[PDB]
């Protein structure tokens, strides 16, 4: 019967609530009372990369922690050499509506997607000294919000049609389709070992997907609005979600519930980007107040401010070696704090 | 600087020169955002416009040393709240409503709600609205035996084929604007009408002229 479905759903949801409440010994804030705070940390803009002539919607770091790609609405994908503030490539796009961008782990390919529902993959290292479109993955029916390279021949994408997909670049067709969300899928982040990945949706929920199997493992729901950004703790057992109610949150996979929340009564605007440090102590969070924040992951107390931008900060990233932090805003300037 | 690094700086300078050139070339052109409502017939609209010497889609119109781009968001299941901030610098929105759909279930009230939400967004404060009321002939043929006095509340005018229906619908669609700052460039478009591109040109020229009056301390 139709009522039996609702009855079973309510019973199982209450069972899961009581279960995840049973295994709640003490909050993370209590166990971290006897820890020396990080105090105050100040960072200064060592570089300023200025070649974009419009808003900056995405940014990714290379695995050598030196090169970084950035995507702008002027139909450009610029590959900066962060050390000497050079330009290595300036790829001109086909559709000037890009909302995401990625850099391959091996350093060969880049990828970008936007309102054209197509994820284009450019091949940097080749002969002919030209950057040409390798493939164009077109299977989605909504704007592509995020895309992260898994391998040189596999890529994960998340779209505004409430679906995530795993594409094999060689053939060019979806091998696996993750369909568990009700709202749009705003962000996505891969595991340090690339066996699992989480996705945050516009229905105030994050989901943990198993790449190999292809089904939702766990579903975390603590927020009160859409989840704009998501990242992983370097350990791999916890993650952080930034939403539009000006509250970051830190969930843990094994405990299967929310660990911490980072809320200050001053900040009211949404959260655009979230990332961790190399050790997982700091928590960088961009805001719509045009200034980043640095939260203490264990103590939930603010420890710094990065106010250099003139407009909303749309993208934020931390190198693999933790040496620097790149932030890109809607004023065509992305800065490298250290 | 080593021998190879200087050539890298030269390549970067060439890249930046090309970026500046393309930036000015894209600064010449203007962008309009076409926002069709439900079954308002905006396919034949763009077809008729393009035929007479005129996934997201972009139609470029080269008009007298000026290049317009009619950005059309055709198919999107994305609730409009997430990607609309991409169109923050568009010169003017182009809102296409249908006149003969005041009976279908109503649909006209949904078009009104959509118009109000799109017009009240904080991104569109420096951009005008160009309201195109398509399907006029079908309204002339449909105004009989319809008597919109019962579909819509007052319609104090005569219950006849008089064109007070067109003016009443336009008054409904105009009164949703936050008053006294933004001007609506209404127009009554038929299925076969050549003057659409000329009216778009006139409305865009007037929008630029008013922004220039505001910016140059002249008002």
């Amino acid at each position, epitope marked *: 019967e139709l009522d039996q479905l609702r009855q079973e759903a309510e019973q199982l949801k209450n069972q899961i609530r009581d279960a995840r409440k049973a295994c709640a010994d003490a909050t993370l804030s209590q166990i971290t009372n006897n820890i020396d705070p990080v105090g105050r940390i100040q960072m200064r803009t060592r570089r300023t990369l200025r070649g974009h002539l419009a808003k900056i919607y995405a940014m990714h770091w290379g695995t050598d922690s*030196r*090169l970084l790609v950035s995507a702008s609405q002027d139909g450009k994908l610029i590959i900066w*050499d962060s050390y000497t503030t*050079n330009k*290595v*490539h300036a790829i001109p796009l086909r559709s000037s509506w890009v909302m995401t961008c990625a850099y391959a782990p091996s*350093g060969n390919y880049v990828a970008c997607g936007g309102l054209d529902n197509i994820c284009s993959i450019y091949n940097l290292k080749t*002969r*002919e*000294g*030209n950057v040409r479109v390798s493939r164009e993955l077109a299977g989605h029916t909504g704007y592509l919000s995020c895309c992260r390279f898994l391998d040189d021949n596999q890529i994960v994408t998340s779209s505004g049609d409430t679906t995530c997909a795993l594409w094999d670049i060689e053939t060019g067709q979806q091998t696996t389709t993750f369909t568990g969300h009700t709202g749009d899928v705003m962000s996505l982040s891969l595991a340090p070992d690339t066996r699992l990945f989480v996705s945050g949706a516009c229905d105030a929920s994050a989901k943990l997907w198993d790449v190999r199997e292809g089904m939702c493992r766990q579903t975390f729901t603590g927020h009160e609005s859409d989840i704009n950004a998501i990242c992983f703790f370097p350990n791999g057992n916890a993650f952080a979600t930034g939403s539009d109610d000006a509250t970051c949150r830190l969930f843990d996979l094994r405990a299967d519930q929310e660990l911490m929340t980072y809320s200050h009564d001053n900040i009211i605007c949404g959260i655009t980007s979230v990332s961790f440090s190399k050790s997982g102590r700091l928590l960088l969070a961009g805001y719509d107040d045009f200034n980043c924040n640095v939260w203490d992951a264990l103590k939930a107390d603010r420890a710094g401010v990065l106010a250099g931008h003139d407009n909303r900060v749309s993208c934020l990233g931390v190198t693999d070696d933790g040496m620097a932090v790149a932030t890109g805003s809607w004023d065509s300037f992305l800065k490298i704090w250290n | 600087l*080593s*021998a*190879e*690094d*200087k*050539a*890298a700086v*030269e*390549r970067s300078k*060439m890249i930046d020169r090309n970026l500046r050139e393309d930036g000015e070339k894209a600064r010449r052109e203007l962008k309009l955002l076409l926002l069709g409502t439900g079954e308002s017939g905006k396919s034949t609209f763009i077809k008729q416009m393009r035929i007479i010497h005129g996934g997201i889609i972009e139609y470029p119109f080269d008009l007298q040393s000026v290049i317009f781009r009619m950005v059309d968001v055709g198919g999107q299941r994305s609730e409009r709240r997430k990607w609309i901030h991409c169109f923050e610098n568009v010169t003017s929105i182009m809102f296409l409503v249908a006149l003969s759909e005041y009976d279908q279930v109503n649909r006209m009230e949904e078009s009104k709600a959509l118009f109000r939400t799109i017009i009240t967004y904080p991104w569109f404060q420096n951009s005008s609205v160009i309201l195109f009321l398509n399907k006029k002939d079908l309204l002339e043929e449909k105004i009989m035996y319809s008597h919109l006095v019962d579909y819509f509340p007052e319609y104090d005018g005569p219950q006849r084929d008089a064109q007070a229906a067109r003016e009443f619908i336009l008054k409904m669609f105009v009164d949703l604007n936050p008053d006294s700052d933004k001007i609506i460039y209404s127009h009554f478009t038929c299925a076969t009408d050549t003057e659409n591109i000329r009216f778009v040109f006139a409305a865009v020229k007037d929008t630029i002229l008013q922004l220039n009056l505001k910016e140059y301390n002249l008002v």
Partner: single-chain antibody, 231 residues
Framework: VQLVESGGGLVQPGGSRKLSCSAS????????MHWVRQAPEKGLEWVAY????????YYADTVKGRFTISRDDPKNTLFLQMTSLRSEDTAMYYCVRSIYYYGSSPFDFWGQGTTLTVSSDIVMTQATSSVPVTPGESVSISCRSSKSLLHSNGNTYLYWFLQRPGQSPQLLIY???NLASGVPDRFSGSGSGTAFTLTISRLEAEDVGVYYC?????????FGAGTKLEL
């Protein structure tokens, strides 16, 4: 990815001439070009260089003043105007392409060249003239530089080229540590300042030839004398 030279022939001493290199298959407008000559039986020596966009041009001192280099980007050609050809320019000039950005492999693709007949500087040396080699045995080549090639940014500019009998040389290893594309993984390079070594493991066929080590510091690009692995 194809260069074709044109010109050459017999020329009386003092006359002028032009050499034209046609480039097809790549983005010629984005590649700097070098003209590197080779004597009848001697090694390679660099003659001229023109960057991308003609913004930077360099010459060797032995050809400075009587040579002119230029490029035609729409037609995709490279022109070398020679004036007052002496008796020392009886050489087979080669045209090389190279692109300089972070992580690039310059001097990667050489092209066939024409043959003429005209009837300070880092002096790099490779004292090993000829080394006996047996197929399947690891061998080594040693190159010595006058001054330290290790720059401030940690990039030691040493290149290794292999010339097979009757063909154009190719890029084996660039910056002394990175293997070029299309080269078997058996080649390797490792060394310290002013003393660099090339190691070959399990020597295979088509490996007999000459080996040149080139520095890339001050742009009188000097090659080595060359070592020939004879069976």
């Amino acid at each position: 990815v194809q260069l074709v030279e044109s010109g050459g022939g017999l020329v009386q001493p003092g006359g002028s001439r032009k050499l034209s290199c046609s480039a097809s298959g790549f983005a010629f407008s984005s590649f700097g070009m070098h003209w590197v000559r080779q004597a009848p039986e001697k090694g390679l020596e660099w003659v001229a260089y023109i960057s991308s966009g003609s913004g930077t041009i360099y010459y060797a001192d032995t050809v400075k003043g009587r040579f002119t280099i230029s490029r035609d980007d729409p037609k995709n050609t490279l022109f070398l105007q020679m004036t007052s050809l002496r008796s020392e320019d009886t050489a087979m000039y080669y045209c090389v392409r190279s692109i300089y950005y972070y992580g690039s492999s310059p001097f990667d693709f050489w092209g066939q060249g024409t043959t003429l007949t005209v009837s300070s500087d880092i002096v790099m040396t490779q004292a090993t003239s000829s080394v006996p080699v047996t197929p399947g045995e690891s061998v080594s080549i040693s190159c010595r530089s006058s001054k330290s090639l290790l720059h401030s940014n940690g990039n030691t500019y040493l290149y290794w080229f292999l010339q097979r009998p009757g063909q154009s040389p190719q890029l084996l290893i660039y910056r002394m540590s990175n293997l070029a594309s299309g080269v078997p993984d058996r080649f390797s390079g490792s060394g310290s300042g002013t003393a660099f070594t090339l190691t070959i493991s399990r020597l295979e066929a088509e490996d007999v030839g000459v080996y040149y080590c080139m520095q890339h510091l001050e742009y009188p690009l000097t090659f080595g004398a060359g070592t020939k692995l004879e069976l």
